[PDB]
Ligand binder design. Structure first.
Ligand SMILES: CC(C)(COP(=O)(O)OP(=O)(O)OC[C@H]1O[C@@H](n2cnc3c(N)ncnc32)[C@H](O)[C@@H]1OP(=O)(O)O)[C@@H](O)C(=O)NCCC(=O)NCCS
Ligand SMILES: CC(C)(COP(=O)(O)OP(=O)(O)OC[C@H]1O[C@@H](n2cnc3c(N)ncnc32)[C@H](O)[C@@H]1OP(=O)(O)O)[C@@H](O)C(=O)NCCC(=O)NCCS
Ligand code: NI
Ligand code: NI
Ligand code: NI
Ligand code: NI
Ligand code: NI
Ligand code: NI
Ligand code: NI
Ligand code: NI
Ligand code: NI
Lengths: 401, 401
């Protein structure tokens, strides 16, 4: 009948609307647990130039070694964790060359290691969350350290013992912005599916990227100074039961954009020689020059324009990027503290960094008695940077401690 | 107060709540356009054994060739489209070996071909849709034919000229169920974002899977009899404006599950020799034995138990899979018509198949004057089959013609 409602000519369509109403969640996606893992083996950055040029038979490349020493010194990295050991490299001479035929060997090690390290981080996140693993409805797995069919998502599912009907999304080779990407993904999964609990795992390592030095590619030396191993895990859910679950952050919005005229600035090829990485000298300039446009597009609907009034999580893959953004925007020197703390303690773990940093920030906030998980502030930004060039921008809201 | 006034923005609770209220769409993710593309070069299946054993210099493997002839005759494939030509293969003897070092040569061709073919399909889908491409907010790109950084999603974005702010999700190496996967993905993206319009593109080809014959891997011969090139594109959006947009299918629900005891039944490895594919002989038994459980889980909440009362789209990875599903469930002989039609005309194009089949069904329904896009029926199921073993189950609702 006539009134302030419309009608449907089919009952099945009415049934569809009932289904949709019942299948979806109400609130914003929230982060409920965060955990990290690293391989036990660790290299001290100060000792790495001698170790690296030794193991790659390159002691005679004197100019090159001097450049690498400067790279490791400017890296602002104290230590890095690596599955890759002297023993493993000795058994794989082709990985020690610059472009040796070595993908198969890299793959044979990495494809087992990726979900293994991921499981270690996941188990902890599940333990913090406190709920049975049979309540996890979704899994997001993220890596750039080796592709396989079925993927690391399948391997993790069987390793942990998740429900066979767990809904999986496998995010392969998206590189250093992907830690933000899977937050963008987890937000839509969690908010569109009622009661859904999303396990989010990333796991990165240096197995496919390690290679000997070369005059042909000084940009490769940059990678050898920075890349590191690490895994991180999250439990994400909307509508938390606060009697058993403890929200840490709301995922308010998530954006992604391509930087104009940056085409080709960062490239990564999966080849017979493994994963090759090429970096133009221009990369930090591109990011620092464009980052405010992302801040403005993200925070204008929130009414914020003062970038010192929000808390910051920024992928610290290149120190120059953080340094130039800090200067360009006039950030207070403590804004990127948690970000730089993770880079110093762990190095560039690609997608895992921003999640290490969230954990570091909520931990320090708790033990220093800060008012929020966002260093006492309400609103925050989390950035992923990587190939495209691509900027991922996640707006977060903190929770009271 | 009396004085000059400046402006103030709303506090956290009001701002958080307004964001949450404004963020979501209301209705179900709906498919608004479908388009397909294939490379111009086509091989007739009846001639393929002679062609295949000739180009790989294996004319003396007369026994194997006779087996391959039976595989191609049983394939129920008439023709296949392939970017790979006789001319390309003669210039790449290593691709013609069973396990030749050839990934680099395969990548150099495939990484260009994947977004190119995808672009052809995308352009047509946008044209059917009829809206300016600047209204595309999301892009999902799906391929298993070659990985790169940045990915095919980036390449397609630049080739087409999508907004740099387009939200990209790159789905790599998820194999033959991924056509359903990206429907599952597009559903959550479209439904959780008000006004969002999702371009969904998949592009598959045989460049990394082509290889010479082997007595050790008859399963590889199976692949050489089936795998083919193809791309498909979709526009997906919730809350269509029916004055400018025309709905074809509603994506009602999307599930994913792993088959018990099916470990290793389908594997795909990225190696120095390209993409190797392994298939156990039990694969059709695994799917047909377990498929009814997926039907029950998907359709019980909809009140349906008669599998002939729904329309069917099933990935035609193997004709044996469709044959045993049909037999096991007691399907009428025309249920899988459109599915086997795409297989016959195109072969196994991996993720693209189920989207070709959706296109085939709505085209045939329109030109035969059927009542709905679902062969006159209201509810339908779409199946992806692949590594895991993984069954993706999408429930669809047709639109009236
Ligand atoms: C690596 C890094 C910490 C080095 O610190 P720095 O302040 O650049 O140190 P300097 O510039 O004094 O010295 C670096 C040397 O390596 C060179 N170099 C650095 N990056 C290079 C690149 N991508 N390609 C070629 N050369 C490079 C510099 O030109 C210089 O060479 P030179 O002494 O022969 O002239 C800094 O460049 C950085 O963080 N870069 C970002 C790298 C990046 O894009 N990472 C991925 C982010 S997602
Ligand atoms: C391949 C296929 C078309 C063959 O047709 P068919 O009707 O099964 O023909 P048959 O099974 O009688 O004969 C097939 C021959 O190849 C063999 N064969 C079939 N599939 C095989 C496999 N996966 N691995 C090894 N051998 C296989 C059979 O054993 C038989 O060899 P034999 O004569 O020495 O015993 C059919 O089995 C099929 O469609 N299989 C599914 C393929 C698949 O898994 N696709 C998914 C790819 S991602
Ligand atoms: Ni380089
Ligand atoms: Ni304002
Ligand atoms: Ni610390
Ligand atoms: Ni006043
Ligand atoms: Ni005013
Ligand atoms: Ni005031
Ligand atoms: Ni107001
Ligand atoms: Ni095999
Ligand atoms: Ni046809």
């Amino acid at each position: 009948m006539r009134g302030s409602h419309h009608h449907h000519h089919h009952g099945s369509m009415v049934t569809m609307e009932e289904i949709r109403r019942a299948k979806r969640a109400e609130g914003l996606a929230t982060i409920l647990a965060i955990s990290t893992a690293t391989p036990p083996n660790c290299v001290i950055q100060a000792d790495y130039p001698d170790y690296y040029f030794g193991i790659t038979n390159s002691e005679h490349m004197t100019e090159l070694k001097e450049k690498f020493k400067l790279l490791c010194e400017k890296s602002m990295i104290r230590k890095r964790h690596m599955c890759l050991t002297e023993e493993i490299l000795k058994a794989n001479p082709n990985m020690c060359l610059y472009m040796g035929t070595s993908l198969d060997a890299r793959q044979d090690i990495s494809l087992v290691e990726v979900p293994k390290l991921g499981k270690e981080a996941a188990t902890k996140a599940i333990k913090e969350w406190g709920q049975p693993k049979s309540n996890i409805t979704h899994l997001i797995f993220c890596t750039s350290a080796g592709v396989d069919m079925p993927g690391a998502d399948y391997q993790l599912t069987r390793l942990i013992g998740l429900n066979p009907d767990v809904k999986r999304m496998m995010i392969y080779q998206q590189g250093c912005y992907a830690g933000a990407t899977i937050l963008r993904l987890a937000k839509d999964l969690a908010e569109n599916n009622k009661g859904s609990r999303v396990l989010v795992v990333c796991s990165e390592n240096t197995i496919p990227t390690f290679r000997g030095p070369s005059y042909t590619h000084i940009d490769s030396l940059v990678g050898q100074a920075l890349f590191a191993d690490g895994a991180a895990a999250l439990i994400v859910g909307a509508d938390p039961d606060t009697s058993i679950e403890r929200p840490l952050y709301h995922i308010v919005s998530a954006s992604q954009t391509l930087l104009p005229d940056s085409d080709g600035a960062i490239e990564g090829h999966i080849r017979e020689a493994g994963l090759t990485v090429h970096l133009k000298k221009d990369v930090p300039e591109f990011f620092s020059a464009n980052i405010e446009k992302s801040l403005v597009d993200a925070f204008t609907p929130i009414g914020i324009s003062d970038w010192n009034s929000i808390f910051w999580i920024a992928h610290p893959g290149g120190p120059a990027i953080l340094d130039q953004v800090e200067a360009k925007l006039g950030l207070k020197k403590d804004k990127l503290r948690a970000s730089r703390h993770v880079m110093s303690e762990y190095g560039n773990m690609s997608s895992a960094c921003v999640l290490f940093i969230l954990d570091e920030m909520r931990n320090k906030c708790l033990e220093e008695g800060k008012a929020t998980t966002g260093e006492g502030l309400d609103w925050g930004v989390l950035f992923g940077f990587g190939p495209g060039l691509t900027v991922e921008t996640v707006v977060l809201h903190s929770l009271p401690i």
